[PDB]
Design a protein around this ligand. Structure first.
Ligand code: NI
Length: 341
């Protein structure tokens, strides 16, 4: 049974609600992005209309085999009528193809559903500038002040400089980057660019990357592992045992691994600047945890909401405990009293 925070009142619509069977009264199912917690339930046997971005539509067809007749891609930044209701999709600054959805209800109410997002001041000059929002369905993943992390640009700067130093000191070092979903592609693409290499990966990951409309992608990635000095591996293999085993397979081409685990926030964020980050090392293997986030920091979230001034907020993350829900409601009230809406 579908929870209230995935239904859009006054419409036949749901958001990210594929794991509940046939939802009573749903005429169109929106999908914000291709992350498994959100698509959980879709497959080739699905027979209702799915509305999404072009990129999400490429992934549904090629990776999940949803039939073409049920995939409805919409352009971004464009007023569209769906089952008699005006909607707009906006870039969520999350993973490739991720959107926020603006719904203009027939009674005059305006609702924004952020999906998963990383708030940015650039959003203050989208189509959001032009009108009032009554209800905000908000990605509250990091809604507490202890959640700090650097910009994505500082993080990439750290990674490029680290990789370029190591491989210049030792031309026989291999760089490995972990992955388990779409998103965070800048980590491995930026490192391979500085090194003059394509990125090597499995056929399954190549296939996923080929759905993402990244410009000049054929110039950037490959399934030929031997030709590449930046490899991608599943996130679960990014440990001393998994990396040892990988280096064996490379046929004595390399004698050192430098590996990156992009994480979200970790408690080492509460003490250490990005500049000061050090790896875990065993022998000729070193592993860096780097805090590359595709969700809002607390401060970015607070800025966005204080600018938007919604009349009501409905959290979509951390909703399962009373302590979480109480904490989030307290911050929403501070923000509102501080800004005056
Ligand atoms: Ni996500």
């Amino acid at each position: 049974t579908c929870p209230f925070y995935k239904k859009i009142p006054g419409t036949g619509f749901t958001v990210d609600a594929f794991q509940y069977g046939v939802v009573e009264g749903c005429t169109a199912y929106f999908l914000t992005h291709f992350h498994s917690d959100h698509y959980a339930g879709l497959s080739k046997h699905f027979t209702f209309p799915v509305y999404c971005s072009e990129i999400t539509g490429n992934l549904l067809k090629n990776k999940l085999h949803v039939q073409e007749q049920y995939i409805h891609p919409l352009p971004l930044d464009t007023e569209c009528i769906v089952n008699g209701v005006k909607v707009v999709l906006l870039d969520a600054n999350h993973c490739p193809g991720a959107v926020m959805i603006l719904f203009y209800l027939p009674n005059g109410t305006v609702i924004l559903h952020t999906g998963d997002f990383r708030a940015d001041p650039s959003m203050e000059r989208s189509l959001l500038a032009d009108q009032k929002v009554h209800m905000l369905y908000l990605d509250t993943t990091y809604c507490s002040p202890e959640y700090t992390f650097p910009s994505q640009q500082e993080v990439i700067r750290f990674a490029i400089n680290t990789a370029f130093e190591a491989v210049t000191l030792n031309p026989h070092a291999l760089v490995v980057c972990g992955t388990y979903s779409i998103g965070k592609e800048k980590v491995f693409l930026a490192i391979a660019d500085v090194l003059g290499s394509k990125v090597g990966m499995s056929q399954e990951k190549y296939k996923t990357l080929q759905c993402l409309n990244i410009p000049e992608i054929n110039s950037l990635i490959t399934t030929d592992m031997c030709s590449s000095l930046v490899h991608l591996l599943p996130m679960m293999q990014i440990n001393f045992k998994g990396l040892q085993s990988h280096l064996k397979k490379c046929g004595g081409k390399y004698n050192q691994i430098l590996a990156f685990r992009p994480t979200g926030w970790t408690h080492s964020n509460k003490f250490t600047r990005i500049a000061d980050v050090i790896p875990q090392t065993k022998g000729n293997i070193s592993i860096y945890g780097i805090p590359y986030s595709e969700h809002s920091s607390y401060l970015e979230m607070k800025r966005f909401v204080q600018w938007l001034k919604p009349q009501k907020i409905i959290p979509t993350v951390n909703v399962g405990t009373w302590k979480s829900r109480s904490t989030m409601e307290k911050y929403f009230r501070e923000w509102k009293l501080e800004a005056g809406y």
